[PDB]
Design a protein around this motif. Structure first.
Motif, PDB file in Angstrom:
ATOM      1  N   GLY B   1      16.487  77.051   9.743  1.00  0.00           N
ATOM      2  CA  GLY B   1      17.520  77.915   9.209  1.00  0.00           C
ATOM      3  C   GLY B   1      18.319  77.412   8.039  1.00  0.00           C
ATOM      4  N   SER B   2      18.634  78.260   7.058  1.00  0.00           N
ATOM      5  CA  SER B   2      19.260  77.711   5.859  1.00  0.00           C
ATOM      6  C   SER B   2      20.048  78.764   5.119  1.00  0.00           C
ATOM      7  N   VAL B   3      20.854  78.265   4.183  1.00  0.00           N
ATOM      8  CA  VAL B   3      21.443  79.122   3.171  1.00  0.00           C
ATOM      9  C   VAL B   3      20.325  79.737   2.348  1.00  0.00           C
ATOM     10  N   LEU B   4      19.304  78.940   2.062  1.00  0.00           N
ATOM     11  CA  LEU B   4      18.178  79.333   1.244  1.00  0.00           C
ATOM     12  C   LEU B   4      16.962  78.671   1.822  1.00  0.00           C
ATOM     13  N   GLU B   5      15.933  79.456   1.921  1.00  0.00           N
ATOM     14  CA  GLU B   5      14.686  78.979   2.409  1.00  0.00           C
ATOM     15  C   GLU B   5      14.101  77.925   1.463  1.00  0.00           C
ATOM     16  N   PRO B   6      13.222  77.069   1.977  1.00  0.00           N
ATOM     17  CA  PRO B   6      12.667  75.986   1.148  1.00  0.00           C
ATOM     18  C   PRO B   6      11.982  76.400  -0.157  1.00  0.00           C
ATOM     19  N   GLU B   7      11.112  77.432  -0.201  1.00  0.00           N
ATOM     20  CA  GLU B   7      10.452  77.752  -1.478  1.00  0.00           C
ATOM     21  C   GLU B   7      11.506  78.017  -2.553  1.00  0.00           C
ATOM     22  N   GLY B   8      12.615  78.645  -2.183  1.00  0.00           N
ATOM     23  CA  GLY B   8      13.609  79.021  -3.166  1.00  0.00           C
ATOM     24  C   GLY B   8      14.454  77.802  -3.487  1.00  0.00           C
ATOM     25  N   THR B   9      14.590  76.901  -2.502  1.00  0.00           N
ATOM     26  CA  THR B   9      15.210  75.609  -2.765  1.00  0.00           C
ATOM     27  C   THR B   9      14.425  74.822  -3.803  1.00  0.00           C
ATOM     28  N   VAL B  10      13.106  74.719  -3.639  1.00  0.00           N
ATOM     29  CA  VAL B  10      12.318  73.961  -4.610  1.00  0.00           C
ATOM     30  C   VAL B  10      12.462  74.599  -5.977  1.00  0.00           C
ATOM     31  N   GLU B  11      12.308  75.933  -6.034  1.00  0.00           N
ATOM     32  CA  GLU B  11      12.414  76.660  -7.294  1.00  0.00           C
ATOM     33  C   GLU B  11      13.620  76.235  -8.119  1.00  0.00           C
ATOM     34  N   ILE B  12      14.775  76.035  -7.481  1.00  0.00           N
ATOM     35  CA  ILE B  12      15.953  75.583  -8.242  1.00  0.00           C
ATOM     36  C   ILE B  12      16.077  74.055  -8.379  1.00  0.00           C
ATOM     37  N   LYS B  13      15.828  73.274  -7.321  1.00  0.00           N
ATOM     38  CA  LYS B  13      16.184  71.848  -7.221  1.00  0.00           C
ATOM     39  C   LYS B  13      15.019  70.886  -7.015  1.00  0.00           C
ATOM     40  N   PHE B  14      13.816  71.189  -7.491  1.00  0.00           N
ATOM     41  CA  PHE B  14      12.741  70.185  -7.420  1.00  0.00           C
ATOM     42  C   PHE B  14      11.693  70.316  -8.529  1.00  0.00           C
ATOM     43  N   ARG B  15      12.171  70.135  -9.754  1.00  0.00           N
ATOM     44  CA  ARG B  15      11.442  70.280 -11.002  1.00  0.00           C
ATOM     45  C   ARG B  15      10.711  68.988 -11.398  1.00  0.00           C
ATOM     46  N   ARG B  16      10.121  69.094 -12.582  1.00  0.00           N
ATOM     47  CA  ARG B  16       9.250  68.101 -13.186  1.00  0.00           C
ATOM     48  C   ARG B  16       9.911  66.731 -13.141  1.00  0.00           C
ATOM     49  N   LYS B  17      11.145  66.641 -13.641  1.00  0.00           N
ATOM     50  CA  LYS B  17      11.916  65.404 -13.688  1.00  0.00           C
ATOM     51  C   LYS B  17      11.783  64.663 -12.373  1.00  0.00           C
ATOM     52  N   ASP B  18      11.997  65.399 -11.287  1.00  0.00           N
ATOM     53  CA  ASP B  18      11.871  64.824  -9.964  1.00  0.00           C
ATOM     54  C   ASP B  18      10.441  64.407  -9.706  1.00  0.00           C
ATOM     55  N   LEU B  19       9.468  65.139 -10.253  1.00  0.00           N
ATOM     56  CA  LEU B  19       8.087  64.715 -10.034  1.00  0.00           C
ATOM     57  C   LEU B  19       7.851  63.366 -10.676  1.00  0.00           C
ATOM     58  N   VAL B  20       8.331  63.216 -11.900  1.00  0.00           N
ATOM     59  CA  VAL B  20       8.196  61.958 -12.607  1.00  0.00           C
ATOM     60  C   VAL B  20       8.878  60.830 -11.847  1.00  0.00           C
ATOM     61  N   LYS B  21      10.141  61.038 -11.462  1.00  0.00           N
ATOM     62  CA  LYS B  21      10.844  60.114 -10.574  1.00  0.00           C
ATOM     63  C   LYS B  21       9.996  59.679  -9.387  1.00  0.00           C
ATOM     64  N   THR B  22       9.293  60.639  -8.792  1.00  0.00           N
ATOM     65  CA  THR B  22       8.566  60.348  -7.567  1.00  0.00           C
ATOM     66  C   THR B  22       7.317  59.526  -7.808  1.00  0.00           C
ATOM     67  N   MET B  23       6.564  59.850  -8.855  1.00  0.00           N
ATOM     68  CA  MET B  23       5.456  58.986  -9.230  1.00  0.00           C
ATOM     69  C   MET B  23       5.933  57.577  -9.521  1.00  0.00           C
ATOM     70  N   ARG B  24       6.981  57.448 -10.340  1.00  0.00           N
ATOM     71  CA  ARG B  24       7.433  56.107 -10.681  1.00  0.00           C
ATOM     72  C   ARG B  24       7.829  55.314  -9.434  1.00  0.00           C
ATOM     73  N   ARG B  25       8.277  55.981  -8.348  1.00  0.00           N
ATOM     74  CA  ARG B  25       8.641  55.191  -7.171  1.00  0.00           C
ATOM     75  C   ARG B  25       7.465  54.919  -6.252  1.00  0.00           C
ATOM     76  N   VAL B  26       6.546  55.881  -6.154  1.00  0.00           N
ATOM     77  CA  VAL B  26       5.561  55.923  -5.085  1.00  0.00           C
ATOM     78  C   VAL B  26       4.126  55.844  -5.590  1.00  0.00           C
ATOM     79  N   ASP B  27       3.805  56.521  -6.686  1.00  0.00           N
ATOM     80  CA  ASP B  27       2.419  56.508  -7.142  1.00  0.00           C
ATOM     81  C   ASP B  27       2.037  55.151  -7.727  1.00  0.00           C
TER      82      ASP B  27
END
Lengths: 78, 77
Positions: B1-27
């Motif tokens: 349960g949420s204010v906003l469901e996850p797909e709509g959460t990602v749409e606003i708050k999980f963009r490319r920048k975060d993808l780059v961040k994530t590769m640099r930490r984990v990939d």
């Protein structure tokens, strides 16, 4: 919302929407019943991007398409 | 349960920048590229090559990381 409903049965509530009312704001204005809507404002819950993405295309181009006076005034919501 | 469901959460708050961040930490591959580009006195060959290798790694990597992101958002809910 609840308080506003009770309040509504007891005192006068009026509300004016200038730019956009989202979520709880929308619901309270509607609950307030008496509602003013400025031109070019829009009244929605979930964004065009989300809906277009789930539906695979750009159905709507502007939130005003969804909640503007051209919708809510034409349907009696405003 | 949420204010906003996850797909709509990602749409606003999980963009490319975060993808780059994530590769640099984990990939590991991304780390590697960055490790060499993070070397002083590099040949313009290695430099240009690394930047290209990076764009290729990122785009090839794009599918998985979106699902991880939405999962993460849902865990708040």
């Amino acid at each position: 919302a609840g308080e506003s409903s009770l309040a509504y049965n007891e005192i006068i509530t009026i509300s004016l929407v200038t730019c956009r009312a989202i979520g709880i704001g929308a619901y309270l204005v509607r609950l307030g019943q008496r509602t003013i809507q400025v031109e070019n404002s829009h009244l929605i819950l979930t964004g065009a991007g989300a809906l277009n993405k789930v539906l695979g295309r750009e159905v709507y181009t502007s939130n005003n398409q969804l909640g503007g006076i051209q919708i809510m005034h034409n349907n009696g919501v405003t | 349960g949420s204010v906003l469901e996850p797909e709509g959460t990602v749409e606003i708050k999980f963009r490319r920048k975060d993808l780059v961040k994530t590769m640099r930490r984990v990939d590991p591959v991304y780390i590697h590229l960055a490790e060499r580009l993070g070397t002083p006195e590099l040949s313009t060959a290695e430099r240009k090559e690394l930047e290209n290798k990076l764009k290729e790694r990122e785009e090839f990597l794009i599918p998985i990381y979106h699902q991880v992101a939405v999962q993460f958002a849902d865990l708040h809910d």
